[PDB]
Write an enzyme that holds these catalytic residues in place. Structure first.
Site, PDB file in Angstrom:
ATOM      1  CG  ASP A 286       3.451  28.361  27.122  1.00 35.20           C
ATOM      2  OD1 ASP A 286       4.512  27.745  27.080  1.00 35.20           O
ATOM      3  OD2 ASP A 286       2.351  27.755  27.114  1.00 35.20           O
ATOM      4  CD  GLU A 492      -2.267  23.090  22.433  1.00 35.54           C
ATOM      5  OE1 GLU A 492      -1.164  23.721  22.284  1.00 35.54           O
ATOM      6  OE2 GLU A 492      -3.143  23.447  23.200  1.00 35.54           O
TER       7      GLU A 492
HETATM    8  O1  6BV Z   1       8.337  23.887  28.311  1.00 35.35           O
HETATM    9  C1  6BV Z   1       7.956  25.168  28.703  1.00 35.35           C
HETATM   10  C2  6BV Z   1       6.510  25.507  28.181  1.00 35.35           C
HETATM   11  O2  6BV Z   1       6.288  25.089  26.894  1.00 35.35           O
HETATM   12  C3  6BV Z   1       5.084  25.215  26.091  1.00 35.35           C
HETATM   13  S1  6BV Z   1       4.748  24.207  24.719  1.00 35.35           S
HETATM   14  C4  6BV Z   1       5.909  24.632  23.395  1.00 35.35           C
HETATM   15  C5  6BV Z   1       5.300  24.697  22.005  1.00 35.35           C
HETATM   16  O3  6BV Z   1       4.190  25.524  22.093  1.00 35.35           O
HETATM   17  C6  6BV Z   1       6.386  25.226  21.078  1.00 35.35           C
HETATM   18  O4  6BV Z   1       5.900  25.250  19.756  1.00 35.35           O
HETATM   19  O5  6BV Z   1       7.498  24.312  21.127  1.00 35.35           O
HETATM   20  C7  6BV Z   1       8.167  24.094  22.385  1.00 35.35           C
HETATM   21  C8  6BV Z   1       9.185  22.954  22.202  1.00 35.35           C
HETATM   22  O6  6BV Z   1       9.454  22.402  23.482  1.00 35.35           O
HETATM   23  C9  6BV Z   1       7.125  23.734  23.445  1.00 35.35           C
HETATM   24  O7  6BV Z   1       7.748  23.869  24.728  1.00 35.35           O
HETATM   25  C10 6BV Z   1       4.016  24.676  27.133  1.00 35.35           C
HETATM   26  O8  6BV Z   1       2.717  25.123  26.632  1.00 35.35           O
HETATM   27  C11 6BV Z   1       4.093  24.937  28.613  1.00 35.35           C
HETATM   28  O9  6BV Z   1       3.103  24.170  29.419  1.00 35.35           O
HETATM   29  C12 6BV Z   1       5.543  24.701  29.123  1.00 35.35           C
HETATM   30  O10 6BV Z   1       5.677  24.875  30.498  1.00 35.35           O
END
Ligand code: 6BV
Length: 603
Positions: A286, A492
């Site tokens: 992730d 979330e």
């Molecule tokens: O976009 C690609 C992946 O992103 C993460 S969420 C992540 C967040 O945890 C982080 O702090 O900031 C990012 C800003 O976009 C988020 O994508 C998501 O948990 C996944 O489901 C997703 O496919």
């Protein structure tokens, strides 16, 4: 004269993989394993570092309002850089196409997964996967980070709307998205092999492995407080069905199992998914997942790289600090800390997906596919899905009352009211335009108000008031009202109210409206929310979840063009003090049980 086996489209994938692997430098190998954000990508970066993959995170778009061709030109510019390397290995571009191609202006927006669970219609979901792949390919993108097969066990989780159900059997059945996105696997297919049919389909991603939907309060920073089965029983089964359907990739969870971060969990990633389920596609992190192995996150990136790669992850969604990643991993292999067998396994898997899906044959976007974006047939499908997702919770205040629904299309005057009646962003919810979703007219679509105006007889006068007071309602001479209220968009860690009460004015509007005229309340939410005060006020109440861009799906049932068929895919709690409380709980005391839903007949 200048034949190279890996460039021969007639050769078997495994032979092409091995032929290519055998030619690669370590820099070329580690480049394959690196996925970077488009915002940090340039042609020189992509070439010099032999980059394997790019993504758009939520909201990462080439411009506000960009056309399908603009997306195709962006992706192709990146591809041309990649194809210009020594070995010419095409990159794969990934995006969260999780309810349609939802980052893109004018894309069809499908209901979120909780509403799809209400439909209990796996063939519908397959067809949505098919439509989604076309819309993703419209924009030149080859890879969708879906489905989320989380089994959300507590609706306070800010991603609970991305889970089809608290019941893993419904989640398992909705793994039919996979062969929609990717194509149906051959008759003799071996479970765990990756599959994509070709250029009109996309690689899929079962996510987030494993137990992302598990407690505690609600799910959401965690953890999974559960034990083996727990696992095997609630959170894992749908990943087996994903293997059987040839899912190309699996994304790892930020969460932990039995106190081990999943991004460092060799036993489950290598021992179970790869070695027991015989997964042969690629495992992706992730976003900064590896950074989060440590606390604070990012405080020992060297260890993050070592731990994640030895755990068995194949491709790392860095996504920004690519130099650090590549440098550290190179250092680890040069030092013997990570063996070349591990790198070679990662690269084999990445290449196997790329060869299998036809990426070496069709590395570039098809301009003729641009018109798939927002295509009306797909919108018709989304309208069907939204209508099927609706759960009728109440249709009359007493057992003597005439049912309110279906409403007549012909009436002198009717009222449409509420914060959610004319708000396309709210009706789509999170992961739309992006990442957090947004308010107002963020894309092409039909609000509830616009749907009503398009449905009713020409003689019917339709009056809109966002938040009318009681006198306004009583003096208007309305036949009935449709009042729409509910949650604002969230995720979330942002906008997630754990009291599960809808924002005001919401209840106060329903009370003012329903106090003056018979009302049908349309509740827009990602999950069950405290509902008794809304039920008490309303003649009829519909849980519409997050129905997407096609608001006529809501009116199709309200006015009786089709009957209500949706059934609750989650338990509806009486109180948040009950939670978590799922079907099978020792003390199962729901307001409405999982599977509840009233019906109507078409008029
Ligand atoms: O976009 C690609 C992946 O992103 C993460 S969420 C992540 C967040 O945890 C982080 O702090 O900031 C990012 C800003 O976009 C988020 O994508 C998501 O948990 C996944 O489901 C997703 O496919």
């Amino acid at each position: 004269a200048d034949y190279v086996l890996y460039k021969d489209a007639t050769k078997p994938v495994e032979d092409r993989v091995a032929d290519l692997l055998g030619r690669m430098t370590l820099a070329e190998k580690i480049g394959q394993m690196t996925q970077i954000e488009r915002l940090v990508a340039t042609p020189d970066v992509l070439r010099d570092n032999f980059i394997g993959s790019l993504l758009s995170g939520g909201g990462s778009v080439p411009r506000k309002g960009a056309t399908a061709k603009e997306w195709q030109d962006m992706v192709d510019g990146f591809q041309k850089a990649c194809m210009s390397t020594r070995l010419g290995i095409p990159m794969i571009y990934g995006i969260d196409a999780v309810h349609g191609q939802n980052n893109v202006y004018g894309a069809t927006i499908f209901p979120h997964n909780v509403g799809l669970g209400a439909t209990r219609d796996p063939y519908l979901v397959k067809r949505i996967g098919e439509a989604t792949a076309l819309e993703v390919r419209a924009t030149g993108i080859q890879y969708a980070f879906a489905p989320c097969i989380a089994v959300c066990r507590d609706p306070r989780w800010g991603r609970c709307y991305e889970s089809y159900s608290e019941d893993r059997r419904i989640v398992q059945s909705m793994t039919e998205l996979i062969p929609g996105l990717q194509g149906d696997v051959p008759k003799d297919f071996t479970s765990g092999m990756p599959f994509v049919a070709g250029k009109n389909k996309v690689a899929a991603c079962a996510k987030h492995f494993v137990g992302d939907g598990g407690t505690v309060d609600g799910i959401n920073e965690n953890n999974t407080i559960i034990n083996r089965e727990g696992l095997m029983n609630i959170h894992m089964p749908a990943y087996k069905n994903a293997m059987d359907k040839g899912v190309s990739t699996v994304m790892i969870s930020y969460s932990s199992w039995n106190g081990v971060k999943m991004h460092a969990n060799q036993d489950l990633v290598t021992g179970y998914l790869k070695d027991t389920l015989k997964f042969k596609g690629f495992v992706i992190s992730d976003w900064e997942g590896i950074d989060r192995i440590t606390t604070p996150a990012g405080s020992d990136y060297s260890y993050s790289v070592k731990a994640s790669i030895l755990a068995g992850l194949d491709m790392i969604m860095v996504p920004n600090k690519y130099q650090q990643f590549i440098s550290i991993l190179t250092g680890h292999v040069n030092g013997g800390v990570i063996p070349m067998s591990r790198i070679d396994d990662a690269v084999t898997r990445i290449l196997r997906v790329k060869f299998t899906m036809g990426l070496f044959e069709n590395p570039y976007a098809d301009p003729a596919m641009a018109e798939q974006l927002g295509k009306q047939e797909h919108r018709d499908l989304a309208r069907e899905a939204a209508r099927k997702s609706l759960v009728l919770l109440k249709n009359g205040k007493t057992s003597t009352d005439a049912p309110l629904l279906p409403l007549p299309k012909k009436a002198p005057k009717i009222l449409v009211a509420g914060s959610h009646a004319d708000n396309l962003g709210y009706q789509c919810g999170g992961w739309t335009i992006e990442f957090q979703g947004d308010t107002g007219r963020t894309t092409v679509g039909t609000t509830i108000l616009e749907a009503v105006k398009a449905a009713v007889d020409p003689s019917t006068v339709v009056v809109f008031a966002e938040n009318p007071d009681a006198e306004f309602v009583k003096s208007g001479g309305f036949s009935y009202a449709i009042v729409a209220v509910g949650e604002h968009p969230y995720t979330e860690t942002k906008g997630d109210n754990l009291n599960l009460t809808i924002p005001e004015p919401g209840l106060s509007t329903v009370q003012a409206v329903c106090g003056g005229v018979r009302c049908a309340t349309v509740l827009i939410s990602g999950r069950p929310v405290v509902v008794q005060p809304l039920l008490a006020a309303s003649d009829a109440l519909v849980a519409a979840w997050l129905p997407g861009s096609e608001g006529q799906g809501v009116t199709d049932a309200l006015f009786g063009d089709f009957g209500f068929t949706g059934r609750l895919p989650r338990t509806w709690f009486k109180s948040v003090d009950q939670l978590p409380m799922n079907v099978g709980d020792a003390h199962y005391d729901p307001l409405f049980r999982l599977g509840y839903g009233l019906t109507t007949n078409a008029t």
